[PDB]
């Protein structure tokens, strides 16, 4: 219970926003919002922006490590993939916001041990057809890392053993099969 020091995070993080505008190219619709590197600065940003459940369909938030843009094209994403949590419309009210926050805490908390280095970031897609949350990792052939991340993330989300989540390569998503499953 400290009195004046802030609590530094392992990494500096950038929050990005995406606004659906079909008259533009996909990457022109990405806006960098803010960056932070302490627990206090995280909460101050979180408390000052809308819950994902209140965004317009077509919008995203992404939290990525500083220097990694939330796009396949980035050098740290092009060889990577994502652990995908899919939700229907009717779970928006009940699950979206608490899953998304849990995902933020796994990122900024460095909850995957050594393998947190493989984490690039996370994305929440709010969509009329069904929302998605995912953790993007740097290298889909780092089997030990990808598998430990997904096992721990499913546990942290608190999902039943009989709901199975999948890991997709971005190369496959661009052109989806799963490389791993948990």
């Amino acid at each position: 219970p400290e009195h004046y020091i802030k609590h530094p995070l392992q990494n500096r993080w950038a929050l990005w926003f995406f606004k659906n505008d079909k008259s533009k190219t996909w990457q022109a619709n990405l806006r960098l919002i803010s960056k932070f590197d302490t627990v206090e600065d995280f909460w101050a940003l979180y408390n000052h922006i809308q819950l994902s459940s209140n965004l317009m369909p077509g919008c995203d938030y992404s939290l990525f490590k500083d220097g990694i843009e939330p796009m396949w094209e980035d050098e740290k994403n092009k060889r990577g993939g994502r652990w995908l949590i899919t939700l229907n419309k009717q779970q928006r009210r009940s699950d979206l916001d608490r899953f998304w926050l849990e995902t933020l805490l796994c990122l900024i908390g460095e909850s995957f041990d050594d393998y947190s280095d493989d984490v690039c970031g996370a994305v929440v897609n709010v969509r009329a057809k069904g929302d998605k949350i995912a953790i993007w990792t740097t290298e889909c052939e780092n089997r030990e890392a990808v598998t430990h991340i997904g096992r721990v993330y499913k546990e942290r989300l608190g999902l039943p053993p009989k709901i199975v989540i999948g890991y997709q390569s971005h190369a496959d998503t661009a052109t989806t099969k799963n490389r791993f499953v948990v």
């Binding site: 995070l9 392992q10 909460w43 849990e102 908390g109 942290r156």
Partner: peptide, 14 residues
């Protein structure tokens, strides 16, 4: 530098 869920959530409250 690592923080558990509970240590992170504590600062939201404090």
């Amino acid at each position: 530098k690592r923080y558990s869920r509970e240590q992170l959530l504590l600062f939201q409250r404090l």
